RNA sequence: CUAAGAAAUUCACGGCGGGCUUGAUGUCCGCGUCUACCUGGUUCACUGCCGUAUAGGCAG
């Protein structure tokens, strides 16, 4: 439970068009959690210093999902819908470097820490965060601001260290009315490890054993299907170095000549989509990223979710 | 508990997305759902009660699908006269604990 | 030689539904145009009355339902404000051919069953069973809750031979008891008629009209229907907008002749049933752990030729008279 | 040995629906033909009311219609036997006779009246056997338990509840509410309650004024009688009395006196027996 | 500081001609739904009471 938020912030219903749907070399679907943990850090270096606050955690709640896919004739797999790119200066068609896209309706429980809570009102913070977050892009996709027939959904804020124990189930059961048509994505790292010593029949690794939880696999009649622990998905769970760290000028194709570089690989894990009524406290639902730069581990998870 | 959650999911889907009601035809066994599938509509949808500002005793839904779950199966016979039939009434004493106040807090 | 897997018996003693009618006393010798007791609609509110949920007497759940009402809507049947005697009229048909089943797979079993009932009949007639059915006709028993708290109950039984009355009986039903089966002249004369009907010795039709003087404007109790503003709580049985008792309820009130049990010190008759059980007591008296029960006694007396006690043969033949789906 | 699961009692002291007719005064004993309220315009010729219902006092107290355990059956019947060996029903019967004495079955057609007279007739046939006349404004309605020649009407109901005779009571109430105001019958789901095109009161509302007995309750005796109810509540004034936390309550006083044979100076058992006379599906589990 | 940052699938079209689905049949037989209640909670604007501007005879 590192850096417990003194305030939760609910960016209520963000509508996103053309988000990246590939998300890893192995997975596809809902985009990576590192996109969200980078989005909250891009908020943090635009309004977080001007308000002296700290946006550090993020809760991912997907309300609506739609992918540009199509199922071919005579196959049970999917293929991705594409865009026609511009031509070359030769007049010929360029290569088809395929990309997956998805529409996306999301909610973001942010978590605020600093001393700027105690200087500004709770309504000043929420507008300066919301109207900033309509200038940015989430997963390569445009955050589309509100216009409709209904009313724009407002950006609330709790102060979850404030109140009695009756307010600690009056407040955290008031936001859950605004998160309930969708599902929350949490990190399940203990399941994939306790399913690894569960396999005593074979002695596998975590690669073939995360592939054995994605399955609606069918067991022989002693037919039947093996039991469901929930709605489990594979997620990208960070990065891992495959190179030593380079000095910040000794590659001349970097994004900048002031930051060190590593060549990294992906690092795959397990997650679960669950209704937010199973959630005891909504601060346990937040995504952080910790790094071990002495190792090569750059990863993200939801800690404090038992 | 998954069914108790996806019932609330169904309630939340029908809560939004439906900007009209014409409930006069077609219904002859489906009643007492103004606390369960009805928005506020900025209008007194009362039924000669205090429905619009008060929403208590929600056994018109809670027990009414707690019996729906029991009548999902009737061929189970030898559970009667056993100490394991008490275990089946444990989690239905649990979903009759956690379901009330999340149905009163929407009408205020 | 085994019990057949299919055994069906048609009912003997089949009554109709009982139409309720309302009139004054001493106008009951001219009761051919008395109006029907109708079924009305009233609204009914009462507070909570049950036992409260134990271990849930906390003041959270406590202060919710006890101030919010319970607005029902029921049916009632009442006498009119100028009428103090209920008229209940039905028709009883006695058929005969008691031991002959409708459906039966085996023919050796049918051959043994017909001989067992045919040697019951000539050894001792239907006059004992008919003497006990005539008592339940002679007192009112079919007036179920219409009989308790009555001034006078009078029962008239006519024998409709062709289209007119071949013989009229006339019973004051309260002097005739509800526990004892004492013998009378005109009641043995009715037992003879029902006993000839049960043995196929003539066609028998009976019209039974009971007059119970309960009081002016009071509530009568027709039988209650299963409910599938606007009649939410109680439905009462009526046939062509006239309140009525079910035929099977009257039939239950006639077959209450069973006064033999494994455990008895005087409790009155219950209805003849296999595994002889009372719905208003939750209890079975002929449980098969005691070996006095219809299937045990029937199977012994037909297969193994174990002739029962002479009192239990009456119970077995009464179960054949009521009908049923036996066999499996 | 323990409580059964299925138990119900039947409604003793069952009234009928009280039809209400108007009519002009000085035709009182010759009231064979007074018309009823013909609907919704009320005259000024008729200056008084006429409320008639019949009342049956059945008999049997602790005999259930449908029990479930025979040991509990005989224990409850011997508890009612030890109650009835102690005394008759006459202490409850005089308090029922008190509600019969006035016209408190006129709920709001009595408040605002100048002279109300109640006539109770105990009838064996169509012939009337013994008659009574009481003055409703001049007799009690609260306490002090004192009026002469009402003890015979008490002993009648005590015999009828103990079973010493068939009792049928044919009551008439003349309410001088004034020279033809607009009286108020019961109301169904807004429409006034009728019987045949004549206005009337429900028999549970006529009957609710009859078990308005209970002047014994946890608070002080300054407010008077409440209707004998399990968890004895008031449905519209709002106060829901006789909480099960404290012990004076019907299910507590029934289950501790049948199963756990309690007998201190607790002779206010009249609430429990008055609930058994009310009847109802008592419990169970 | 987000597997970051970028992107026009487009033009045209005749699905169509024909056709015998038949023949036969026993759903029966038995049954107790009961007990209780205050709509004394805010449950459509029915022809005969001299003028929105604060102003005027209600044996309803």
Coordinates of N, CA and C in Angstrom, one line a residue, chain D residues 16-118:
Chain D
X16 N -70.5 -9.1 11.4 CA -70.9 -9.0 10.0 C -70.8 -7.5 9.6
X17 N -70.8 -7.3 8.3 CA -70.7 -5.9 7.7 C -71.9 -5.1 8.2
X18 N -71.6 -3.9 8.8 CA -72.7 -3.1 9.4 C -73.2 -2.2 8.4
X19 N -74.5 -2.5 7.9 CA -75.1 -1.6 6.9 C -75.6 -0.4 7.7
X20 N -75.5 0.8 7.1 CA -75.9 2.1 7.7 C -77.0 2.7 6.9
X21 N -78.1 2.9 7.6 CA -79.3 3.5 7.0 C -79.6 4.8 7.8
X22 N -80.1 5.8 7.1 CA -80.5 7.0 7.8 C -82.0 6.9 8.1
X23 N -82.6 8.0 8.5 CA -84.0 8.1 8.8 C -84.3 9.1 9.8
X24 N -85.6 9.6 9.8 CA -86.0 10.7 10.7 C -86.3 10.1 12.1
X25 N -86.1 10.9 13.1 CA -86.4 10.6 14.5 C -87.9 10.6 14.7
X26 N -88.3 10.1 15.9 CA -89.7 9.8 16.3 C -90.3 8.7 15.4
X27 N -89.5 7.9 14.7 CA -90.0 6.7 14.1 C -89.1 5.6 14.5
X28 N -88.6 5.6 15.8 CA -87.5 4.8 16.2 C -87.8 3.4 16.4
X29 N -88.9 3.1 17.2 CA -89.3 1.7 17.4 C -90.0 1.2 16.2
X30 N -90.7 2.0 15.4 CA -91.2 1.7 14.1 C -90.3 1.9 13.0
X31 N -89.1 1.4 13.1 CA -88.0 1.5 12.1 C -87.9 0.3 11.2
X32 N -89.0 -0.3 10.8 CA -89.1 -1.4 9.9 C -88.6 -0.9 8.5
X33 N -89.0 0.3 8.1 CA -88.6 0.8 6.8 C -88.0 2.2 7.0
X34 N -86.7 2.2 7.3 CA -86.0 3.4 7.1 C -85.1 3.2 5.9
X35 N -85.0 4.1 4.9 CA -84.2 3.8 3.7 C -82.7 4.0 4.1
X36 N -81.8 3.4 3.3 CA -80.4 3.5 3.4 C -79.9 4.6 2.5
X37 N -78.6 4.9 2.7 CA -77.9 6.0 1.9 C -77.8 5.6 0.5
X38 N -78.6 6.2 -0.4 CA -78.7 5.9 -1.8 C -77.8 6.7 -2.6
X39 N -76.8 6.1 -3.2 CA -75.8 6.9 -4.0 C -76.1 6.6 -5.5
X40 N -74.9 10.2 -4.3 CA -74.2 10.6 -3.1 C -74.6 11.9 -2.5
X41 N -76.0 12.1 -2.4 CA -76.6 13.3 -1.9 C -77.4 13.0 -0.7
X42 N -77.2 13.7 0.4 CA -77.9 13.3 1.6 C -78.8 14.4 2.1
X43 N -80.1 14.0 2.5 CA -81.1 15.0 2.8 C -81.0 15.7 4.1
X44 N -82.0 16.5 4.4 CA -82.1 17.1 5.7 C -83.3 16.7 6.5
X45 N -84.2 15.9 5.9 CA -85.3 15.3 6.7 C -84.8 14.3 7.7
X46 N -83.9 13.4 7.3 CA -83.4 12.4 8.2 C -82.4 13.0 9.2
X47 N -82.6 12.9 10.5 CA -81.8 13.5 11.5 C -81.0 12.6 12.3
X48 N -81.0 11.3 12.1 CA -80.3 10.3 12.8 C -79.9 9.1 12.0
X49 N -78.9 8.3 12.5 CA -78.3 7.2 11.7 C -78.9 5.9 12.3
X50 N -78.5 4.8 11.7 CA -79.0 3.5 12.1 C -78.0 2.5 11.6
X51 N -77.2 1.9 12.5 CA -76.1 1.0 12.1 C -76.4 -0.4 12.8
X52 N -76.6 -1.4 11.9 CA -77.0 -2.7 12.4 C -76.0 -3.8 11.9
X53 N -75.5 -4.6 12.8 CA -74.8 -5.7 12.4 C -75.1 -6.8 13.4
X54 N -74.9 -8.1 13.0 CA -75.1 -9.2 13.9 C -73.7 -9.7 14.3
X55 N -73.7 -10.3 15.5 CA -72.4 -10.7 16.1 C -72.6 -12.1 16.6
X56 N -71.7 -13.0 16.3 CA -71.7 -14.4 16.7 C -70.6 -14.6 17.7
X57 N -70.9 -15.1 18.9 CA -69.9 -15.4 19.9 C -69.7 -16.9 20.0
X58 N -68.6 -17.4 19.4 CA -68.6 -18.8 19.0 C -68.3 -19.8 20.1
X59 N -67.1 -19.7 20.7 CA -66.8 -20.7 21.7 C -65.6 -21.5 21.3
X60 N -64.8 -22.0 22.3 CA -63.5 -22.5 22.1 C -62.5 -21.4 22.1
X61 N -61.4 -21.6 22.9 CA -60.4 -20.5 22.9 C -59.0 -21.0 22.4
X62 N -58.5 -22.1 22.9 CA -57.1 -22.4 22.5 C -57.1 -23.7 21.7
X63 N -58.2 -24.0 21.0 CA -58.2 -25.1 20.1 C -57.9 -24.6 18.7
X64 N -56.8 -25.0 18.1 CA -56.4 -24.5 16.8 C -57.3 -25.1 15.7
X65 N -57.5 -24.4 14.6 CA -58.1 -25.0 13.4 C -57.1 -26.0 12.8
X66 N -55.8 -25.7 12.7 CA -54.8 -26.5 12.1 C -53.5 -26.4 12.8
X67 N -53.2 -27.4 13.7 CA -52.0 -27.5 14.5 C -51.0 -28.3 13.7
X68 N -49.8 -28.6 14.3 CA -48.8 -29.4 13.7 C -48.2 -30.4 14.7
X69 N -48.2 -30.1 16.0 CA -47.6 -31.0 17.0 C -48.6 -31.3 18.1
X70 N -48.8 -32.6 18.4 CA -49.8 -33.0 19.3 C -49.5 -32.8 20.8
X71 N -48.2 -32.8 21.1 CA -47.8 -32.5 22.5 C -48.0 -31.0 22.7
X72 N -47.6 -30.2 21.8 CA -47.9 -28.7 21.9 C -49.4 -28.5 21.9
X73 N -50.1 -29.2 21.1 CA -51.6 -29.1 21.1 C -52.2 -29.4 22.5
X74 N -51.8 -30.5 23.1 CA -52.4 -30.7 24.5 C -51.8 -29.8 25.5
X75 N -50.6 -29.3 25.4 CA -50.0 -28.4 26.3 C -50.7 -27.0 26.2
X76 N -51.0 -26.6 25.0 CA -51.8 -25.3 24.8 C -53.2 -25.5 25.3
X77 N -53.9 -26.6 25.1 CA -55.2 -26.9 25.6 C -55.2 -27.0 27.1
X78 N -54.2 -27.5 27.8 CA -54.1 -27.5 29.2 C -53.7 -26.2 29.8
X79 N -53.0 -25.3 29.0 CA -52.8 -24.0 29.5 C -54.1 -23.2 29.5
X80 N -54.9 -23.3 28.4 CA -56.2 -22.7 28.4 C -57.1 -23.3 29.4
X81 N -56.9 -24.6 29.7 CA -57.7 -25.2 30.8 C -57.3 -24.7 32.2
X82 N -56.0 -24.4 32.4 CA -55.7 -23.8 33.7 C -56.0 -22.3 33.8
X83 N -56.1 -21.6 32.6 CA -56.7 -20.3 32.6 C -58.2 -20.3 32.9
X84 N -58.9 -21.3 32.4 CA -60.4 -21.3 32.5 C -60.8 -21.9 33.8
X85 N -60.0 -22.7 34.5 CA -60.3 -23.1 35.8 C -60.2 -22.0 36.8
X86 N -59.2 -21.1 36.6 CA -59.0 -19.9 37.4 C -60.2 -19.0 37.5
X87 N -60.7 -18.7 36.3 CA -61.8 -17.8 36.1 C -62.5 -18.0 34.8
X88 N -63.7 -17.5 34.6 CA -64.3 -17.5 33.3 C -63.7 -16.6 32.4
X89 N -64.4 -16.4 31.3 CA -64.0 -15.3 30.3 C -64.6 -14.0 30.7
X90 N -65.2 -13.8 31.9 CA -66.1 -12.7 32.2 C -65.3 -11.4 32.3
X91 N -64.0 -11.5 32.7 CA -63.2 -10.2 32.7 C -62.9 -9.7 31.3
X92 N -62.6 -10.6 30.4 CA -62.6 -10.2 29.0 C -64.0 -9.9 28.5
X93 N -65.0 -10.6 28.9 CA -66.3 -10.4 28.4 C -66.9 -9.1 28.8
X94 N -66.7 -8.6 30.0 CA -67.2 -7.3 30.4 C -66.5 -6.2 29.6
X95 N -65.2 -6.4 29.2 CA -64.5 -5.4 28.5 C -65.0 -5.4 27.0
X96 N -65.3 -6.6 26.5 CA -66.0 -6.6 25.2 C -67.4 -6.0 25.3
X97 N -68.1 -6.2 26.4 CA -69.4 -5.6 26.6 C -69.3 -4.1 26.8
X98 N -68.2 -3.6 27.2 CA -68.0 -2.1 27.3 C -67.9 -1.5 25.9
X99 N -67.2 -2.2 24.9 CA -67.2 -1.7 23.6 C -68.5 -1.9 22.9
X100 N -69.3 -2.9 23.3 CA -70.6 -3.1 22.8 C -71.5 -2.0 23.4
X101 N -71.2 -1.5 24.6 CA -72.1 -0.6 25.3 C -72.3 0.8 24.6
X102 N -71.1 1.4 24.2 CA -71.2 2.5 23.4 C -71.3 2.2 21.9
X103 N -71.4 3.1 21.1 CA -71.2 2.9 19.6 C -69.8 3.3 19.2
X104 N -68.7 2.6 19.8 CA -67.4 3.0 19.3 C -67.0 2.3 18.0
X105 N -67.9 1.4 17.5 CA -67.8 1.0 16.1 C -68.3 2.0 15.1
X106 N -68.9 3.1 15.6 CA -69.0 4.3 14.8 C -67.7 5.1 15.0
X107 N -66.8 5.1 14.0 CA -65.4 5.6 14.2 C -65.4 7.1 14.3
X108 N -65.8 7.8 13.1 CA -65.9 9.2 13.2 C -67.4 9.7 13.0
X109 N -68.3 8.7 12.8 CA -69.7 9.1 12.8 C -70.3 9.2 14.3
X110 N -69.4 9.0 15.3 CA -69.8 9.2 16.7 C -69.2 10.4 17.3
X111 N -68.0 10.8 17.0 CA -67.5 12.1 17.5 C -68.1 13.2 16.7
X112 N -68.8 14.1 17.4 CA -69.7 15.1 16.8 C -71.2 14.7 16.9
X113 N -71.6 14.0 17.9 CA -73.0 13.5 18.0 C -73.5 13.9 19.4
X114 N -74.8 14.2 19.4 CA -75.5 14.8 20.6 C -76.2 13.7 21.4
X115 N -76.6 12.6 20.9 CA -77.2 11.5 21.6 C -77.1 10.2 20.8
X116 N -76.4 9.2 21.3 CA -76.2 7.9 20.6 C -76.7 6.8 21.5
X117 N -77.6 6.0 21.0 CA -78.2 4.9 21.8 C -78.0 3.6 21.1
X118 N -77.6 2.6 21.8 CA -77.2 1.3 21.3 C -78.1 0.2 21.9

